[PDB]
């Protein structure tokens, strides 16, 4: 199967890279563009849908200077993985403590 | 020090024809060193200018004293201490429509200059020799700062 493709610009060899993601929507596009805009080494980053009856998303990444656009992608993706991991870890403990406290105060 | 123009202005009128926008307003200024009419638009939400205030206006290029002229502007990088940290309002626009005074049909020496900061208009009038540079096509940075005394 085809997960992701890479389209590099004719002029810029490793400065303007467009990743083509298959079978995805604006969910992973907006979170990823946020995570990459959090990075200070990125100039232009943006996702767009090819067609509403399709599932191909073009996501462009540009870095200020001479730096490949593949590293910030995985960097932001791992940072988002850690963010959701921590969000789940805190939510589980909050739910647990609230539930045990409610059960205690009820009976 | 590539200073194209610098002076101290005072606001006489502000937004005379009612109010149309919610973030931009017209400004009418005047000077004391050289007789000149300066009109520009500034953001009220960011820079809340009021009536009867004195500010300092500087039009120049090449913020950094080190470099001759640089290629691209970087937002957080501060390699060279520029003039923007000392002031409090920065714009980057270009000049166009170099025309003069048309009221005086015979000999006059009053020249005007129009600048467009990507939508916001600026009109300057004044002496011929006071305007030393101000070429037809020039990328110029505007610098404004409040002077409260």
């Amino acid at each position: 199967k085809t997960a992701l493709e890479m389209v590099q610009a004719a002029g810029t060899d490793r400065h303007c890279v467009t990743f083509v993601l298959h079978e995805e929507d604006h969910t992973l596009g907006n979170s990823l563009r946020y995570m990459i805009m959090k990075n200070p080494e990125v100039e232009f980053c943006g996702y767009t849908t090819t067609h509403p009856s399709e599932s191909k998303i073009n996501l462009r990444i540009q870095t200020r200077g001479t730096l490949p656009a593949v590293e910030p992608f995985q960097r932001g993706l791992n940072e988002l993985m850690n963010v959701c991991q921590h969000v789940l870890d805190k939510f589980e403990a909050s739910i647990k403590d609230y539930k045990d406290q409610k059960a205690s105060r009820n009976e | 020090a590539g200073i194209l123009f610098e002076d101290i202005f005072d606001v006489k009128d502000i937004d005379p024809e009612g109010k149309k926008f919610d973030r931009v307003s017209r400004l009418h200024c005047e000077s004391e060193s050289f007789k000149m009419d300066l009109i520009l638009d500034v953001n009220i939400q960011i820079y809340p200018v009021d009536l009867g205030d004195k500010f300092r206006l500087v039009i120049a290029s090449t913020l950094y004293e080190d470099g001759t002229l640089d290629d691209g502007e970087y937002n957080p990088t501060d390699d060279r201490p520029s003039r923007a940290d000392q002031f409090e309002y920065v714009m980057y626009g270009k000049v166009y429509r170099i025309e003069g005074d048309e009221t005086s049909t015979e000999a006059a020496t009053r020249l005007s200059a129009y600048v467009s900061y990507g939508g916001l208009l600026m009109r300057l009038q004044g002496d011929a020799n006071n305007l030393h540079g101000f070429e037809v096509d020039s990328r110029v940075y505007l610098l404004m700062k409040k002077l409260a005394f």
Binding site: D25, H26, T27, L28, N30, S31, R33, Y34, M37, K38, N39, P40, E79, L80, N82, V83, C84, H86, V87, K90, F91, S94, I95, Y98, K99, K102 | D22, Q45, I46, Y47, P48, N75, P76
Partner: protein, 148 residues
């Protein structure tokens, strides 16, 4: 005086009689020339918090502090579709003697949700209609009307 309205512009969102100002979320590096924000992960961990307001039989109300709209909207979007569950797909009707349509009956039966744990069941391969034991649940329905 103006710096205060500046930090308040990005913190809270003002509501007017017509139109809403300060809508876009600006907390990225290079935007503001007074502060710096690149990741601050360890600082973000101590600023984020979750609370539970109300928890009912089939409704949960919770609160998230210190988070943007992007990941929250992603959560809300994937809560609907990407979370799988079980539902009726295929229907064999033996003898339909009534007024309702067979297609409408199948649609209304598929609209019926099922109290089952979808974690134990697998995902069906590309295609098979015979039905294995691990990825298909059988249900029977039979009723005929008689006089009293």
């Amino acid at each position: 005086a103006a710096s205060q309205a500046v930090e308040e512009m990005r913190s809270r969102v003002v509501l007017g009689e017509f139109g809403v100002r300060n809508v876009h979320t600006t907390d990225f590096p290079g935007n503001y020339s007074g502060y710096d924000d690149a990741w601050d992960q360890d600082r973000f961990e101590k600023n984020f918090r979750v609370d539970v307001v109300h928890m009912d039989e089939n409704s949960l109300e919770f609160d998230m502090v210190g988070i943007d709209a992007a990941i929250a909207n992603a959560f809300r979007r994937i809560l609907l579709a990407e979370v799988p569950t079980m539902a009726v797909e295929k229907v064999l009707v033996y003898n339909n003697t009534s007024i309702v349509q067979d297609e409408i009956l199948a649609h209304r039966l598929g609209l019926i949700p099922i109290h089952a744990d979808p974690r134990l069941f697998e995902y069906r391969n590309q295609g098979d209609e015979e039905g294995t034991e691990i990825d298909t649940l059988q249900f029977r329905l039979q009723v005929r009307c008689t006089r009293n």
